Enzyme design. Sequence first.
Site, PDB file in Angstrom:
ATOM      1  N   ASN A   1      -7.783   9.752  -5.683  1.00 48.25           N
ATOM      2  CA  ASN A   1      -8.462   8.929  -6.683  1.00 48.25           C
ATOM      3  C   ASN A   1      -9.375   9.885  -7.450  1.00 48.25           C
ATOM      4  O   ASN A   1     -10.467  10.239  -6.983  1.00 48.25           O
ATOM      5  CB  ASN A   1      -9.280   7.815  -6.016  1.00 48.25           C
ATOM      6  CG  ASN A   1      -8.435   6.926  -5.114  1.00 48.25           C
ATOM      7  OD1 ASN A   1      -7.556   6.194  -5.583  1.00 48.25           O
ATOM      8  ND2 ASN A   1      -8.695   6.988  -3.812  1.00 48.25           N
TER       9      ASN A   1
ATOM     10  N   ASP B   1     -13.380   8.997  -8.073  1.00 46.66           N
ATOM     11  CA  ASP B   1     -14.484   9.231  -7.148  1.00 46.66           C
ATOM     12  C   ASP B   1     -14.238  10.344  -6.131  1.00 46.66           C
ATOM     13  O   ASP B   1     -14.979  10.463  -5.169  1.00 46.66           O
ATOM     14  CB  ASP B   1     -14.905   7.942  -6.437  1.00 46.66           C
ATOM     15  CG  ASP B   1     -13.949   7.532  -5.338  1.00 46.66           C
ATOM     16  OD1 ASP B   1     -12.728   7.687  -5.515  1.00 46.66           O
ATOM     17  OD2 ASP B   1     -14.432   7.050  -4.289  1.00 46.66           O
TER      18      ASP B   1
ATOM     19  N   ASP C   1      -6.590   8.303  -0.354  1.00 40.39           N
ATOM     20  CA  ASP C   1      -6.070   7.247   0.511  1.00 40.39           C
ATOM     21  C   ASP C   1      -4.950   7.881   1.332  1.00 40.39           C
ATOM     22  O   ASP C   1      -4.066   8.552   0.776  1.00 40.39           O
ATOM     23  CB  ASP C   1      -5.521   6.087  -0.314  1.00 40.39           C
ATOM     24  CG  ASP C   1      -6.589   5.427  -1.170  1.00 40.39           C
ATOM     25  OD1 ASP C   1      -7.709   5.218  -0.660  1.00 40.39           O
ATOM     26  OD2 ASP C   1      -6.304   5.122  -2.345  1.00 40.39           O
TER      27      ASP C   1
ATOM     28  N   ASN D   1      -9.017   4.876   3.101  1.00 39.69           N
ATOM     29  CA  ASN D   1      -9.862   5.748   2.285  1.00 39.69           C
ATOM     30  C   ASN D   1     -10.796   6.748   3.000  1.00 39.69           C
ATOM     31  O   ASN D   1     -11.550   6.389   3.922  1.00 39.69           O
ATOM     32  CB  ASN D   1     -10.641   4.884   1.294  1.00 39.69           C
ATOM     33  CG  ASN D   1     -11.281   5.688   0.196  1.00 39.69           C
ATOM     34  OD1 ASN D   1     -12.437   6.079   0.306  1.00 39.69           O
ATOM     35  ND2 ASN D   1     -10.545   5.921  -0.880  1.00 39.69           N
TER      36      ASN D   1
ATOM     37  N   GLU E   1       0.802  -1.214   0.000  1.00 41.47           N
ATOM     38  CA  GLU E   1       0.000   0.000   0.000  1.00 41.47           C
ATOM     39  C   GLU E   1       0.839   1.270   0.000  1.00 41.47           C
ATOM     40  O   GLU E   1       0.606   2.172  -0.802  1.00 41.47           O
ATOM     41  CB  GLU E   1      -0.936   0.049   1.209  1.00 41.47           C
ATOM     42  CG  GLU E   1      -2.099  -0.932   1.184  1.00 41.47           C
ATOM     43  CD  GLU E   1      -3.121  -0.649   0.105  1.00 41.47           C
ATOM     44  OE1 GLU E   1      -3.038   0.404  -0.563  1.00 41.47           O
ATOM     45  OE2 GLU E   1      -4.020  -1.500  -0.078  1.00 41.47           O
TER      46      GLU E   1
END
Length: 130
Positions: A46, A49, A53, A60, A35
Amino acid sequence: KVFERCELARTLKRLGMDGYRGISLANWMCLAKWESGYNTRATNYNAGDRSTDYGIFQINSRYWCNDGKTPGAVNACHLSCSALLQDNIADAVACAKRVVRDPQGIRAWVAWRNRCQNRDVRQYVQGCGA
């Protein structure tokens, strides 16, 4: 801060992650590795949407922490997303524990399915004395 492998392993064990909700320490290590590369200040927007993160576990903003700019989001960990960017990982760990308390468990992170599930993850903790 960028943790060294065994340093992080020992830290997570002390914070009670080993076996938390059935998830072994090596699995948490594999997750942090893929990650963020064990980096607490890692952030990833992101564009798809409008969520971001945050931190070592790339948690998130749509469901777990509040950053104010993510539409129709909630804050299940009851933390500002800023808390997930500290060098001290106590809050990130408490939030990671909250995430896996949901039905999906560790599967909530797609990276875990892609790079850790059904694999030999012993290597992430070998020689760390954790």
